[PDB]
Design a protein around this ligand. Structure first.
Ligand SMILES: CC[C@H](C)[C@@H]([C@@H](CC(=O)N1CCC[C@H]1[C@H](OC)[C@@H](C)C(=O)N[C@H](C)[C@@H](O)c1ccccc1)OC)N(C)C(=O)[C@@H](NC(=O)[C@@H](NC)C(C)C)C(C)C
Ligand SMILES: Nc1nc2c(ncn2[C@@H]2O[C@H](COP(=O)(O)OP(=O)(O)OP(=O)(O)O)[C@@H](O)[C@H]2O)c(=O)[nH]1
Ligand SMILES: Nc1ncnc2c1ncn2[C@@H]1O[C@H](COP(=O)(O)OP(=O)(O)CP(=O)(O)O)[C@@H](O)[C@H]1O
Ligand SMILES: Nc1nc2c(ncn2[C@@H]2O[C@H](COP(=O)(O)OP(=O)(O)O)[C@@H](O)[C@H]2O)c(=O)[nH]1
Ligand SMILES: [Ca+2]
Ligand SMILES: [Ca+2]
Ligand SMILES: [Mg+2]
Ligand SMILES: [Mg+2]
Lengths: 439, 427, 346, 54
């Protein structure tokens, strides 16, 4: 058994973390106080769930989590929320004033006064780990803290924990809910500075999730709570193999191996099905073929893009519920003859499949209906570069006129760091085009 | 607990400043005693932005009242809300400034400014994490204009990493017949270009015209003008005073609103326009949206169709459908996209707060950083040059130590401002 | 008000659609880089399909189908036909064809396998390259391919074409096909025969005013002799087929054309359909056909951005607006196309 | 077509299906990073204070 530390950074990182730990606790039948009646090794263990929870002699299961925000409001909701007892005060860290939607204020200015404190808190958790694998880091691309502090944090974990895997859950910016017109700047800046430091990153575009919520949960105007409950089911899905008995993606190293053959191209597309409203009176339960087939519908992707117009390098399917191999193979057979699915030449065309028989858990009173079987596909497709293109274009439009740059220079960053980060993305959009197109 | 320090200066500044405190104090459930008697906890969650708590659960405006004559301050004191203000935060001289920027900035004002800063400092020191300052003042008189700008300069010396925000009242010969106002205002604008981060241009021209043409008030008073100012001020401070996502502090607003440091002069707008007289039909969300963007609802007398919007913030108050708000907001942009610079994507940001202002079921406040605001600065500039080219009235200023040179630099800086806006309207 | 942008200035057809839309007074044109548009009429190269359908509050439509190049590039077309099982190597309406590269994948070897069963059946053995040349002699083309630099196609040249009389002439047919956002396949009822003006000479292959029927390559060398611009339209050619051959256009040629068009576009439907996508596509194609003396139709090439013929711009461009656009963006307040659909049960 | 690596347990199972085969900054460099930024902020703030003193 090898431990994983989750780090949640900035409002988005934190609120998503909350949502994930709420779900993890329900999944593992851990209560709000941290007591777990089904655990019989009191005060200990090296069960699979212990990768994500530590234990006390009092019988208390505590996340291997650290939340960090540069303002206190949001972390104060955790400190006094329904899971207040789950966490040790020392795992919840806050500043007085936030990074004001500025990468540089979060990286250079405020990052400096807080980096050491957080590293020390992360060191306290690492020291309870007999075999730490590494970290899952949750943050927005567009916030000042989420972008700027996170990239600093990622450069340091590379230095102080060099042999250790680092995975991200990253919220990609969408105008329907974004709070700042500079998010494109922040997204590119943090992507640049963070790229070498992250082994595999799962991007979620708020646009995608927002629409899944409108279209499939009939929510007129989605809130963060709506969005996050959905995001947390995808996350749980991705991390289940680390917290449950199984033989697929049993350790963080395996995500890199199974999903990322070319290091810079480390951004697998997640697709999730079925998303079904809890208000829906009559619902026909969807077959293995039906939900597998849905994994190839752009409408169900965490990022809208068209995988028909690039190539695959790897593809995992992760199932929860009443699913057997035989049904999966028939589903896949049919789908291969119907759909456009092209891998790169230097890669087998094939799927790695993970089945957990326990069907998805849902938050009681949530928006999502209980379902008999669900699936999350993780595919490393060059089509996800459409998102990079979009972000870069917006960045070019603004930066051509130096609009808002003075806020960044104002915090000690140099105008040149912009064009250098944009060059890195320029080359990133090029790597993706080489791998995925021919003529 | 992200604290704002409010200062109000001179006649105008204190008039609109007191009005501000009356209106928000009512919105947060605070009575003239300083006692909270409201029925909701949204009212209190962020109260410490604008009020200090005191023993006996007392709420006390974080407000400094400055003038060089007492008249207006005596009026504040024996008025309704006067008891609410902290007595030692009343800081005043006796001589007055005679509508003379030079008296306010250089002579009479210098004698009084250190005392004001002592009070500011006392209020700063008991702030968990001060975000910055807001100032109310006119630019056409002497105290608010010249002393208020003097204060701004000194505050930035002591607190150079805090945000400075003004509600600056721009003069118009439709409202004042005092001949030197364009001087005092050009001299003030020079200061604001360099030393504020956000300035709400509240144009007495626009307020008068709204009162006469739209509200059908044949004889507008300062009371009618101010009712518009207080509504706008409640509106534009809503994201700072209530729980919220967007523009929830001064710095974040600044970051969203100011692409270039000198171009921080905002056109506010309000819907629905009302006189102080009951409004019985609530507005539909489409109506708010159309009205708030209407030129007739702008508090700065500029034609928005003569320029381009760099950034906009919109703030919708009351119980309504966010879905309809997004659809309408989106519909303004998509139907008039050409008025919104294409090189700042998604430049319009929208907030919704459930608590309405008193009087209304529904309201919208518009904050626009548009290049059409030049029209305001050109107007002041035309009035300035008409006198300045004959050095007229200058003796009132040179008699207090000023050189012509200083007028010439100021005119120049404001003409540069104007042409920079023009630059971006054509990009 | 609907809105749109224009990103291909040199498009004969879309120039005309810009005009017709404005003239409704319900469409407003924007500067090409303003992203808040309902409709894009896009550039021909590197059209930014990845930036489409991410504008909240805007249904967005574009006048190209991503992936369509696979039909419309000769190398890709050939490839697509051999490889797709629905078309297959069988395919009886496409000339035997091979993809050949310079030597600065390739199936040069497999080309010769057939070249020396036509030299070992001594029958017609004339081929054609992709600047373009016909030859009986394989290596006089292969040494022409490597001497030009691009990837090319070698195709069986149809030695027995139908020949219009008076004139002993040669022609191709161009048909204009519109595929909407629903993937309805719409054939425009007017096609055009792009004719030669100089008798077909089967013993000499350099004098190419008689072997190539291109509107340009005729002009720039008896242009206008039998009909304007070397363009025979359908009423006349139908009339000629009746008079000379006793048959109709519909029966002898047009069923075959409808068949080839459906087969081509149903083949790629799954790779390019926008039915569930976050932006919708339509596109005009120009299909080019040859007929042999046996009244057998053959597909030459598919054009991604065709031009119309002068006489027909006005009507076609109107049809594009009616079916491709106003279907998606209706107004307040006779059909020139035939719909290609066919559901046989087996 | 070809299933492989079949692994079964009480919780679930996993396998692979194959349709077709083929065909770093130092702690120092960072602390420096931060410190040059801060120096630049100090210069900028100093210049303003020099200007305000004028
Ligand atoms: C448009 C120019 C201002 C606005 C008006 C207004 C001044 C006012 O409102 N005054 C003069 C101090 C008192 C105040 C009003 O009395 C009328 C009280 C009831 C009020 O509105 N009081 C409000 C609630 C109070 O908070 C208050 C606000 C500011 C100052 C003092 C007190 O009187 C109509 N004035 C000068 C006028 O209309 C004058 N006309 C002119 O100056 C014309 N030129 C010769 C104008 C139009 C340019 C006088 C002939 C009367
Ligand atoms: N999905 C999701 N997105 C969020 C959430 N909170 C914020 N965002 C998005 O994240 C971006 C805003 O960044 P935040 O995470 O709020 O920024 P922060 O890290 O707190 O940084 P500062 O406030 O600048 O110090 C925008 O795109 C928001 O829509 C959330 O709870 N869920
Ligand atoms: N296999 C074949 N047999 C007989 N003639 C052929 C042929 N392939 C091409 N041609 C002749 O060559 C002419 C032009 O060739 P092609 O259409 O391939 O080039 P092109 O792309 O420059 C013109 P367009 O784009 O309009 O089709 C045709 O009109 C036809 O007459
Ligand atoms: N809107 C508004 N304008 C005012 C008010 N009082 C004065 N003014 C304007 O302010 C300018 C005179 O400034 P004032 O504040 O009286 O001078 P100060 O006391 O020396 O600061 C003129 O343009 C007046 O029209 C007021 O209460 N409301
Ligand atoms: Ca245990
Ligand atoms: Ca004195
Ligand atoms: Mg934050
Ligand atoms: Mg006065």
């Amino acid at each position: 058994m090898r431990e994983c530390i989750s780090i949640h950074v900035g409002q988005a990182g934190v609120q998503i973390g909350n949502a994930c730990w709420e779900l993890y606790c329900l999944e593992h039948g851990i209560q709000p106080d941290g007591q777990m009646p089904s655990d019989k090794t009191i005060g200990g263990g090296d069960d699979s769930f212990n990768t994500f929870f530590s234990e006390t002699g009092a019988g208390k299961h505590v996340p291997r989590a650290v939340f960090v925000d540069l303002e206190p409001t949001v972390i104060d909701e955790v400190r006094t929320g329904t899971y207040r007892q789950l966490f040790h005060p020392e795992q919840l860290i806050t500043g007085k004033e936030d990074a004001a939607n500025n990468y540089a204020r979060g990286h250079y200015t405020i990052g400096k006064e807080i980096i050491d404190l957080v590293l020390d808190r992360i060191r306290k958790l690492a020291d309870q780990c007999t075999g730490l694998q590494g970290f899952l880091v949750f943050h927005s691309f567009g916030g000042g803290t989420g972008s700027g502090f996170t990239s600093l944090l990622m450069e340091r974990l590379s230095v102080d924990y060099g042999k250790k895997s680092k995975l991200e859950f990253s919220i990609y910016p969408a105008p329907q809910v974004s709070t700042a017109v500079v998010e494109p700047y922040n997204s590119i800046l943090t992507t640049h500075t963070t790229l070498e430091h992250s082994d595999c990153a799962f991007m979620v575009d708020n646009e995608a999730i927002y629409d899944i919520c409108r279209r499939n949960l009939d929510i007129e105007r989605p809130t963060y709570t709506n969005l996050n409950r959905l995001i947390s089911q995808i996350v749980s899905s991705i991390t289940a193999s680390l917290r449950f008995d199984g033989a697929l993606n049993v350790d963080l190293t395996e995500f890199q191996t199974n999903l990322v053959p070319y290091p810079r191209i480390h951004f697998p597309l997640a697709t999730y099905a079925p998303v079904i409203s809890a208000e829906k009176a009559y619902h026909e339960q969807l077959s293995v073929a039906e939900i597998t087939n849905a994994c190839f519908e752009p409408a169900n992707q965490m990022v809208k893009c068209d995988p028909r117009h690039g190539k695959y390098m790897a593809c995992c399917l992760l199932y929860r519920g009443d699913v057997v191999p035989k049904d999966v193979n028939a589903a896949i057979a049919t789908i291969k003859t119907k759909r456009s699915i092209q891998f790169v030449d230097w890669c087998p065309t094939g799927f790695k499949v993970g089945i957990n028989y326990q069907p998805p858990t849902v938050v009681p009173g949530g928006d999502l209906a209980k379902v008999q079987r669900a699936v999350c596909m993780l595919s490393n497709t060059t089509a996800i570069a459409e998102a990079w293109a979009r972000l870069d274009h917006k960045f070019d439009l603004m930066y051509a006129k130096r609009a808002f740059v003075h806020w960044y220079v104002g915090e000690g960053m140099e105008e040149g760091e912009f064009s250098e980060a944009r060059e890195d993305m320029a080359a990133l959009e090029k790597d993706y085009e080489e791998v995925g197109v021919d003529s | 607990m992200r604290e704002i320090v409010h200062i109000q200066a001179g006649q105008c500044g204190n008039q609109i400043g007191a009005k501000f405190w009356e209106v928000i104090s009512d919105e947060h459930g605070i009575d003239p005693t300083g006692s909270y008697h409201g029925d909701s906890d949204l009212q209190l969650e962020r109260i410490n932005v604008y009020y200090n708590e005191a023993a006996g659960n007392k709420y006390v405006p974080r407000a400094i009242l400055v003038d060089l004559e007492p008249g207006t301050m005596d009026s504040v004191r024996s008025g309704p809300f006067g008891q609410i203000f902290r007595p030692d935060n009343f800081v005043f001289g006796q001589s007055g400034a005679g509508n003379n920027w030079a008296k306010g900035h250089y002579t009479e004002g210098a004698e009084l400014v250190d005392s004001v800063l002592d009070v500011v400092r006392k209020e700063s020191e008991s702030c968990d994490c001060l975000q910055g300052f807001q100032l109310t003042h006119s630019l056409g008189g002497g105290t608010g204009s010249g002393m208020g700008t003097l204060l701004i300069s000194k505050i930035r010396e002591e607190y150079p990493d805090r945000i400075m925000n003004t509600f600056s009242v721009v003069p118009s010969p439709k409202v004042s017949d005092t001949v030197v106002e364009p001087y005092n205002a050009t001299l003030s604008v020079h200061q604001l270009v360099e030393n504020t981060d956000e300035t709400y241009c509240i144009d007495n021209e626009a307020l008068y015209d709204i009162c006469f043409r739209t509200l059908k008030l044949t004889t507008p008073t300062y009371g009618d003008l101010n009712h518009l100012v207080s509504a706008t001020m409640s509106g534009v401070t809503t994201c700072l005073r209530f729980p919220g996502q967007l523009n929830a502090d001064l710095r974040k607003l600044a970051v969203n609103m100011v692409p270039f440091p000198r171009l921080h002069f905002f056109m506010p707008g309000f819907a629905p326009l009302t006189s102080r007289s009951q409004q019985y039909r609530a507005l539909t969300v489409p109506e708010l949206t159309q009205q708030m963007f209407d030129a007739k609802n702008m508090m700065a007398a500029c034609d928005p169709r003569h320029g381009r919007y760099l950034t906009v913030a919109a703030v919708f108050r009351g119980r309504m459908s966010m879905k309809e708000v997004d659809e309408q907001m989106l519909n303004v942009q998509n139907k008039n996209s050409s008025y919104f610079v294409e090189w700042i994507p998604n430049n319009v940001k929208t907030a919704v707060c459930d608590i309405p202002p008193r009087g209304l079921k529904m309201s919208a406040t518009f904050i626009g950083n548009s290049t059409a605001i030049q029209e305001l600065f050109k107007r002041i500039s035309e009035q300035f040059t008409a006198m300045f080219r004959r050095k007229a009235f200058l003796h009132w200023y040179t008699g207090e130590g000023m050189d012509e040179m200083e007028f010439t630099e100021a005119e120049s800086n404001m003409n540069d401002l104007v042409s920079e806006y023009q630059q971006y309207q054509d990009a | 008000m609907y809105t749109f942008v224009v990103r291909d200035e040199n498009s004969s057809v879309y120039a005309e659609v810009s005009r017709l839309l404005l003239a409704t007074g319900q469409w407003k044109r924007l500067r090409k880089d303003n992203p808040r548009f309902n409709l894009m009429l896009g550039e021909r190269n590197r059209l930014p399909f990845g930036r489409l359908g991410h504008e909240p509050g805007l249904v967005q439509l574009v006048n190209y189908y991503r992936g369509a190049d696979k039909l419309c590039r000769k190398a890709s077309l050939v490839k697509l036909i051999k490889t797709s099982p629905e078309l297959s190597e069988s395919c009886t309406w496409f000339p035997e064809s091979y993809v050949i590269y310079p030597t600065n994948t390739d199936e040069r070897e497999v080309f010769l396998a057939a070249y020396n069963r036509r030299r070992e059946g001594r029958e017609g053995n004339v081929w054609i390259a992709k600047g373009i040349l016909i030859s009986s002699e394989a290596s006089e083309l292969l040494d022409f391919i490597d001497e030009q630099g691009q990837v090319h196609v070698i195709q069986k040249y149809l030695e027995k074409p139908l020949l219009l009389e008076p004139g002993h002439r040669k022609f191709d047919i161009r048909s204009w096909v519109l595929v909407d956002h629903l993937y309805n396949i719409y054939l425009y009822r007017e096609g055009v025969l792009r004719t030669s003006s100089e008798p077909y000479n089967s013993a000499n292959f350099q004098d190419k005013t008689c072997h190539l029927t291109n509107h340009c390559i005729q002009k720039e060398y008896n242009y206008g002799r039998y009909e304007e611009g070397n363009e025979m339209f359908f009423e006349e050619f139908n009339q000629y087929l009746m008079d000379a051959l006793n048959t109709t256009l519909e029966n002898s040629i047009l069923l075959q054309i409808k068949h080839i068009i459906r087969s081509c576009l149903m083949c790629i439907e799954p790779a390019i359909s926008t039915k569930h996508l976050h932006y919708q596509s339509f596109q005009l194609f120009g299909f080019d056909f040859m007929v042999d003396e046996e009244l057998k139709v053959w597909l030459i090439e598919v054009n991604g951005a065709p031009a119309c013929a002068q006489k027909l711009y006005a009507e076609l461009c109107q049809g594009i607006v009616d079916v491709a656009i106003s279907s998606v963006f209706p107004l307040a307040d006779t059909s020139i196309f035939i719909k290609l659909h066919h559901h046989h049960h087996h | 077509m070809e299933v492989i690596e079949l692994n079964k347990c009480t919780s679930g199972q996993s396998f692979e299906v194959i349709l077709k085969p083929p065909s770093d900054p130092s702690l120092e460099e960072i602390q420096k990073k931060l410190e040059a930024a801060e120096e630049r902020r100090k210069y900028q703030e100093a210049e303003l204070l020099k200007h305000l003193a004028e």
